[PDB]
Structure formats: structure tokens, C-alpha cells
Design a protein around this ligand. Structure first.
Ligand SMILES: Oc1ccc(/C=N/Nc2ccc(Cl)cc2)c(O)c1O
Ligand SMILES: [Mn+2]
Ligand SMILES: [Mn+2]
Length: 181
């Protein structure tokens, strides 16, 4: 019936720190969240997934996403110097200290395999590990290595389902889904 505001939804659905980091992200790119509200939600979603992924194993992962850009490269370059890891061409989302690799996390409602192939074709690296989550609960990962166990990943998928559900109940899902890409 009633169609809600996506900005209202974001500020209610996501933790204050995620929202703030997403605001900083958009401002850093010169974007108005009051107009590009679906993107604001997507940024929040992706940041939450990255944080959940890291939290699945505390201190196993360094978080790169959410930091300001200069600081993100500072962190990446430090990790590369310390661990000997090869420097990525584009900023990744995490660094896995156990498997010794950077990780790019994708969140999509497009077809998960195509999305994976596009990510992989962009970053080009033979080292950076890619992990894609769909709002459908589908996932795809480099070399069928999913990194975390089923329960951790289920928690992330459950979060995505809950977001899609709350959006839909406020009439926001169709627009949000369409806005991707
Ligand atoms: O420049 C942009 C303008 C709008 C968007 C919107 N993305 N929306 C979005 C992205 C991913 C999912 Cl799963 C659902 C929705 C976006 O991702 C952009 O990069
Ligand atoms: Mn990123
Ligand atoms: Mn990502």
C-alpha cells in the first residue's frame, strides 16, 4: 500500500556507524544521498556484508572497505610490505591473514555467475579472491573456495534476506533491485 522512503529505511535498518561510513563514502565521491538513495542503500548493504565477513573470524581479516581512500591505500601498502603480498591494482575489501590474500566481496541481485566473471575480468589478479553473495542466497567464489564455514555465510545470507524482506514490505524492493548496475 504505502510506499516508504529509502533514506528513512537505511537510517532505520543499518547501524549508525555503517550509515555514517556510507555517507562519507558518497561525499568522498561527491554524491548526494538524498537523490541517489538506492545507491546509498547498496553501499550500506555491501559495507555490512564486509563487516559481517570480517566478524565471522575476528582478527583473521583486515578491513579495507569503509576507510577513506588515502588511508585504504596506506593500509594495503603496509600489508603488502609486511606480508610480501602482491599489491592489488584496485582497492579490495579485505585481507585474509590466514590464507594470505586480499578479498573482493560482491553483493548483487544480478545473475551471480555473470557478476563473478565481470569482477574477475576487472581485477584481473591471480591472487585476489572473489566472493559474491546474491540476495537470492546464491554465492560464487574463486576456485569454489568459500573461505568461511556454512554457518557464517548463512548468517550473511539471512541478513540479506531480511533486508530484501523489509524493503519489499515498504514497497522499496522493486526500485532497489532495478537500480543496480
Ligand atoms: O552509480 C550508481 C548508481 C546507483 C547504484 C545502485 N545500485 N543499486 C544496487 C546495487 C546492488 C544491489 Cl544488490 C541492489 C541495488 C549503483 O550501484 C551505482 O554504482
Ligand atoms: Mn570495495
Ligand atoms: Mn566489493
Amino acid at each position: 500500500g504505502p510506499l516508504g522512503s529509502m533514506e528513512d529505511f537505511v537510517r532505520q535498518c543499518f547501524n549508525p556507524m555503517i550509515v555514517e561510513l556510507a555517507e562519507k563514502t558518497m561525499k568522498e565521491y561527491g554524491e548526494d544521498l538524498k537523490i541517489e538513495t538506492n545507491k546509498f542503500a547498496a553501499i550500506c548493504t555491501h559495507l555490512e556484508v564486509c563487516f559481517m565477513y570480517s566478524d565471522a573470524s575476528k582478527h583473521r581479516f583486515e578491513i579495507i572497505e569503509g576507510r577513506d581512500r588515502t588511508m585504504a591505500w596506506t593500509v594495503v601498502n603496509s600489508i603488502c610490505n609486511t606480508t610480501g603480498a602482491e599489491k592489488p591494482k584496485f582497492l579490495p575489501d579485505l585481507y585474509d591473514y590466514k590464507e594470505n590474500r586480499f578479498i573482493e566481496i560482491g553483493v548483487t541481485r544480478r545473475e551471480v555467475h555473470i557478476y563473478y566473471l565481470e569482477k574477475a575480468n576487472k581485477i584481473k589478479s591471480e591472487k585476489t579472491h572473489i566472493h559474491i553473495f546474491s540476495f537470492t542466497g546464491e554465492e560464487m567464489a574463486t576456485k569454489a573456495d568459500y573461505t568461511l564455514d556454512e554457518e557464517s555465510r548463512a548468517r550473511i545470507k539471512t541478513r540479506l534476506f531480511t533486508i530484501r524482506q523489509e524493503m519489499a514490505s515498504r514497497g522499496l524492493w522493486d526500485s532497489f533491485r532495478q537500480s543496480e548496475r
